[PDB]
Design a protein around this ligand. Structure first.
Ligand SMILES: C=C1/C(=C\C=C2/CCC[C@]3(CCCCCCC(C)(C)O)CCC[C@@H]23)C[C@@H](O)C[C@@H]1O
Length: 255
């Protein structure tokens, strides 16, 4: 068959809305980053867990970055066609459960394979593996995260595919605590069908080969990264005075 149906008017509108939503919630110049608590990088070439936890030098800055990003993701989610049709309870459940995953996805835009870092400006706003360990996280999360970023980067997603993937990630019916899974699934299916249709008629080969399957696999990968992040957040939370280095939003989402 190899049918390549055209995007429906609705699907075109959905894509346009998501692109617009992303453009309004993701500043590619990272101009607000100077408003976060300043990044501080202490000497830790040894990757000392003891020293990292005692200082957590990069936590205030990166926690502010994550908090800021969660706010943007909330804004993005609210613009996803159908998201407003869900109960506030389900909206919050989806946002809290997908927050870190969407952050990982959206961060791919600042990630660069030039030096395997998230470059958001001058050296000050260039985040490397070492900066994440300075925030209290370990390689058990960072290494696979980097691998995830590279794999995602190599898919060479169109922005349309990128925003659809984030939307699909958020509107997932298999999140613990969801009430109306059926409605959430209907919304996700509409987005998934849009993505499948877009890839089949807009993505040139050979990058289109099994692209949809590869994208869905990334969503599965995110679940694992989510779980690992939650475990590390727990440990991090055990460190005295940690709450002060976080933010109310971060504490609620991951607490
Ligand atoms: C956010 C965004 C950015 C980078 C994301 C990064 C780079 C640094 C390390 C991170 C974020 C830093 C995590 C700090 C620990 C946060 C808590 C909640 C305490 O565990 C790991 C997940 C995503 C990674 C910059 C820009 O692309 C916006 C994007 O939303």
């Amino acid at each position: 068959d190899s049918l390549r149906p055209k995007l429906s008017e609705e699907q075109q509108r959905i894509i346009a809305i998501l692109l617009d939503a992303h453009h309004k919630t993701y500043d590619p110049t990272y101009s607000d980053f100077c408003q976060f608590r300043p990044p501080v990088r202490v000497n830790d070439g040894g990757g000392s867990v003891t020293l990292e936890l005692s200082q957590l030098s990069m936590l205030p800055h990166l926690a502010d970055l994550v908090s800021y990003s969660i706010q943007k993701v909330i804004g993005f989610a609210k613009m996803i066609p159908g998201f407003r049709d869900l109960t506030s309870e389900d909206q919050i459940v989806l946002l809290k459960s997908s927050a870190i995953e969407v952050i990982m996805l959206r961060s791919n835009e600042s990630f660069t394979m030039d030096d395997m870092s998230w470059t958001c400006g001058n050296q000050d706003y260039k985040y490397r593996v070492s900066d994440v360990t300075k925030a209290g996280h370990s390689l058990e999360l960072i290494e696979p995260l980097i691998k995830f970023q590279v794999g995602l980067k190599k898919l060479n997603l169109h922005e349309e595919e990128h925003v659809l993937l984030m939307a699909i990630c958020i509107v997932s019916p298999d999140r613990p605590g969801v009430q109306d899974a059926a409605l959430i699934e209907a919304i996700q299916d509409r987005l998934s069908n849009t993505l499948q249709t877009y890839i089949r008629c807009r993505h040139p080969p050979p990058g289109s080969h099994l692209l949809y399957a590869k994208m869905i696999q990334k969503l599965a990968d995110l679940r694992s990264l989510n779980e690992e992040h939650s475990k590390q957040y727990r440990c991090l939370s055990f460190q005295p005075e940690c709450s002060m280095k976080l933010t109310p939003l971060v504490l609620e989402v991951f607490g």
